[PDB]
């Protein structure tokens, strides 16, 4: 009695982003989650939280994918941190060959890395969910500063072959509200939620894309799912908190408890 | 949020290890963090054969550093620690960082008949990790390995194993029996220093109990992290997998996990 989702992403030792975010989000929305781990990330506690990154062998990634895609099926799927061009290639190759449905590509950002994302993974996306930095990279334009900027980036990145584009803006956008831009082939919609005044938004992007994936896995319409996911991080950011002086994750259980 | 650490392995099929642990932690509103020790896959064209990919001791150390030094935890469990070095690292971490509410799930590696083919692994579990446990949660196989006795067949066997393994230094022992015990009910044995209690639940007639033991120990851990008494937590955890097994289901022809969301949705919470 469960719908299933795959996340091809990284481990976040601190527990608010990557695999952890993804599994936490999946679980909150009653979707049976499975992970293909691509890197292990740690933050050094005596070195001002310095990211230490431990990449996982391509073969190991293949093995996990084998069992998840060939041996079980998935109703939806997302990519998070794919740290290497080979891994982007493996992910893209898996998606085509296994003909995976409801592909939510979160283009977590080397030149050829950005380019592989653009040239191999983007065209395969049902939904693609860049933030302002990621959006301007994929579209090849300058720093996005206005809601108009986001809109022409959305069109530009949609032109790569992604079905739907969500450009995430929120806290990093100068604006009265927390705004994202949703674009089908046709028209741009501006999604709005309350701005939460908080620096505690670690793993928000991973949680948003996770929340889209989960919703897509349960059979929702793409736009329906994106709205639902917008509802989810808003609640999860509103109840966000600090872990230590470097990092404050979102509260995935927030929608459920309120 | 209350916080819990799991020092355990990744299950690609999503019902056991890290996945079970996180899923359980989340259901019970405990902020989960993982120190990954192995990646395990199952070969789809080779009858679901376990492919195991161990993680470098240094990488494990680094994850532990950030979890234990950089954030704290309210409780903690160990799952699959595939290597003596990894048992030693886990034990060393527990001591040095003075971790509280230590739930040790003594997952054994090289199973065979009723013996472990990696003797010193089992021994390190016995001599180094067991004494550190607030709760230790062996199943029938694991229990007889720790206690040095023969295959457990009866509730009496479980009781003397519990006494034997409590003698290692674990504060509380739960011997898990459930589906693998010939019995009318799904029974586990809880033992403090003093008296043995027989925990009972409905037996669910189902082969879909993959990751049950991981889920049980995660549930204890989560409940401990929220401030519960040890026995209180064990009862709550007993309630949790009962529900999760009752609503269990198949993924394919080889494996059926428990439904972690069951208690939330499938019995009055
Ligand atoms: N302060 C905030 N208040 C409310 N919502 C926010 C806030 N910051 C970000 N969001 C929302 O959370 C989601 C995460 O997007 P974003 O932060 O751009 O990605 P990332 O977290 O990877 O940087 C977006 O839907 C965004 O609108
Ligand atoms: N068929 C079943 N019906 C009800 N409870 C069960 C069943 N099988 C196992 N359990 C319970 O699930 C929990 C997991 O224990 P066990 O299956 O022994 O661990 P493991 O998964 O490590 O083998 C225990 O509390 C046990 O009593």
Curated annotation (Swiss-Prot), chain A:
CDD domains per the UniProt record, alphabetical: HMPP_kinase
Biological process, per Gene Ontology: thiamine biosynthetic process
Transmembrane residue ranges: none
UniProt EC number: 2.7.1.35
Binding site for ATP: 131, 168-172, 180, 196, 205, 230
Assembly description: Homodimer.
Name assigned to this protein: Pyridoxine kinase
Source species: Bacillus subtilis (strain 168)
UniProtKB/Swiss-Prot annotation, chain B:
Signal sequence interval, chain numbering: none
Keywords: ATP-binding, Kinase, Magnesium, Metal-binding, Nucleotide-binding, Transferase
Enzymatic class: transferase
InterPro entries, alphabetized: HMP/HMP-P_kinase_dom, PM/HMP-P_kinase-1, Ribokinase-like
Binding site for ATP: 139, 176-180, 188, 204, 213, 238
Function: Phosphorylates B6 vitamers; functions in a salvage pathway. Uses pyridoxal, pyridoxine, and pyridoxamine as substrates. Can also use hydroxymethylpyrimidine (HMP) as substrate.
Subunit structure of this chain's protein: Homodimer.
Name recorded for this polypeptide: Pyridoxine kinase
Annotated organism of origin: Bacillus subtilis (strain 168)
Record gene name: pdxK
